[PDB]
């Protein structure tokens, strides 16, 4: 029980930071995470033999793909733990435990292939999951390692704490299909301006979650620079291999996804910034004041790619 992860200077200082990069040693990235759960929920939230036990399960079904990989779902959870850290008061211990392992667990078994692309293939997956079809299934996984010999970190909550941990992480993750973001957001924005917005409110808290989910997911455009626009790389290989995909199947894929139309690449990060990434951290200000960094690097970034357009990059 007196077994702390410590972190070296450079990263005990740094993990704390929104921007902060995990850095490239996959190695010491269970570490992280567990150094994650001990300051952000306890040292006793989880049994150590299991909580270590789960994560190496989870990092083994998370596949070797450029982007949807091992290191989305670690600096997914980092975002998530660093949002926590900032709004201390603001969550119960349930959402603590429940959110950082939703993170951790939110694309499991991911292939690198949208929603859209399962169904134009007609996958097995589309028939099972009509609606957000890989967040449904990646939910299936999480339960699946959940209930493996061994595996059960949450086994000393009592059974309607169990019920309600499972609750937010199903939330938690469906919540992360990007389709439903935009519904959510709008709400979110109504309910702040006309003043209803209600922390006590089972219902609003849900979208309140929600939108920390896609905040922590989009969280590549909210690092430094050279991150981003490294990680924009491998976004787009995946994008690129989807398309290629399509083309098999006799659709002409959309520019995004397009490797032939990579001349287009920093007006469709525009749009993008402009259309989700903006709204969304600007949403997450209003409710979350401390949370306000991700917006400033947010469009410290739409800022860089306006000058990747003017030709000074
Ligand atoms: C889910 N998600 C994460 C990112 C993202 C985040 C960070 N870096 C790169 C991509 C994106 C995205 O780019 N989305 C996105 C890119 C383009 C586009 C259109 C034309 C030509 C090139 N790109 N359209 N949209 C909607 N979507
Ligand atoms: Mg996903
Ligand atoms: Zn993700």
Same mark, same amino acid.
């Given at each position: 029980?007196?077994?702390?992860?410590?972190?070296?200077?450079?990263?005990?200082?740094?993990?704390?930071?929104?921007?902060?990069?995990?850095?490239?040693?996959?190695?010491?990235?269970?570490? !992280?995470?567990?150094?994650?759960?001990?300051?952000?929920?306890?040292?006793?939230?989880?049994?150590?033999?299991?909580?270590?036990?789960?994560?190496?399960?989870?990092?083994? &079904?998370?596949?070797?793909?450029?982007?949807?990989?091992?290191?989305?779902?670690?600096?997914?959870?980092?975002?998530?733990?660093?949002?926590?850290?900032?709004?201390?008061?603001?969550?119960?211990?349930?959402?603590?435990?429940?959110?950082?392992?939703?993170?951790?667990?939110?694309?499991?078994?991911?292939? =690198? $292939?949208?929603?859209?692309?399962? +169904?134009?293939?007609?996958?097995?997956?589309?028939?099972?999951?009509?609606?957000?079809?890989?967040? +449904?299934?990646? $939910?299936?996984?999480?339960?699946?390692?959940?209930?493996?010999? =061994?595996?059960?970190?949450?086994?000393?909550?009592?059974?309607?704490?169990?019920?309600?941990?499972?609750?937010?992480?199903?939330?938690?993750? !469906?919540?992360?299909?990007?389709?439903?973001?935009?519904?959510?957001?709008? +709400?979110?924005?109504?309910?702040?301006?006309?003043?209803?917005? &209600?922390?006590?409110?089972?219902?609003?808290?849900?979208?309140?979650?929600?939108?920390?989910?896609?905040?922590?997911?989009?969280?590549?455009?909210?690092?430094?620079?050279?991150?981003?626009?490294?990680?924009?790389?491998?976004?787009?290989?995946?994008?690129?291999?989807?398309?290629?995909?399509?083309?098999?199947?006799?659709?002409?894929? !959309?520019?995004?996804?397009?490797?032939?139309?990579?001349?287009?690449?920093?007006?469709?990060?525009?749009?993008?910034?402009?259309?989700?990434? !903006?709204?969304?951290?600007?949403?997450?200000?209003?409710?979350?004041?401390?949370?306000?960094?991700?917006?400033?690097?947010?469009?410290?970034?739409?800022?860089?790619?306006?000058?990747?357009?003017?030709?000074?990059?």
């Amino acid at each position: 029980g007196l077994m702390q992860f410590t972190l070296p200077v450079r990263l005990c200082k740094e993990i704390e930071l929104f921007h902060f990069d995990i850095g490239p040693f996959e190695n010491m990235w269970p570490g !992280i995470f567990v150094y994650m759960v001990h300051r952000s929920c306890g040292t006793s939230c989880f049994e150590l033999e299991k909580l270590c036990r789960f994560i190496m399960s989870v990092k083994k &079904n998370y596949r070797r793909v450029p982007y949807h990989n091992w290191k989305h779902a670690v600096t997914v959870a980092h975002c998530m733990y660093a949002i926590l850290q900032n709004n201390h008061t603001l969550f119960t211990d349930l959402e603590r435990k429940g959110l950082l392992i939703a993170c951790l667990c939110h694309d499991l078994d991911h292939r =690198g $292939f949208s929603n859209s692309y399962l +169904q134009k293939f007609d996958h097995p997956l589309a028939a099972l999951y009509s609606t957000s079809t890989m967040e +449904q299934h990646h $939910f299936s996984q999480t339960v699946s390692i959940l209930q493996l010999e =061994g595996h059960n970190i949450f086994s000393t909550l009592s059974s309607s704490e169990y019920e309600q941990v499972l609750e937010i992480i199903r939330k938690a993750i !469906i919540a992360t299909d990007l389709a439903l973001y935009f519904g959510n957001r709008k +709400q979110l924005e109504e309910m702040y301006q006309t003043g209803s917005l &209600n922390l006590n409110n089972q219902s609003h808290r849900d979208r309140v979650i929600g939108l920390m989910m896609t905040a922590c997911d989009l969280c590549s455009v909210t690092k430094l620079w050279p991150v981003t626009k490294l990680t924009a790389n491998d976004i787009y290989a995946e994008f690129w291999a989807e398309g290629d995909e399509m083309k098999k199947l006799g659709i002409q894929p !959309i520019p995004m996804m397009d490797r032939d139309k990579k001349d287009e690449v920093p007006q469709g990060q525009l749009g993008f910034y402009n259309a989700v990434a !903006i709204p969304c951290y600007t949403t997450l200000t209003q409710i979350l004041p401390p949370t306000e960094p991700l917006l400033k690097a947010c469009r410290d970034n739409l800022s860089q790619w306006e000058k990747v357009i003017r030709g000074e990059e």
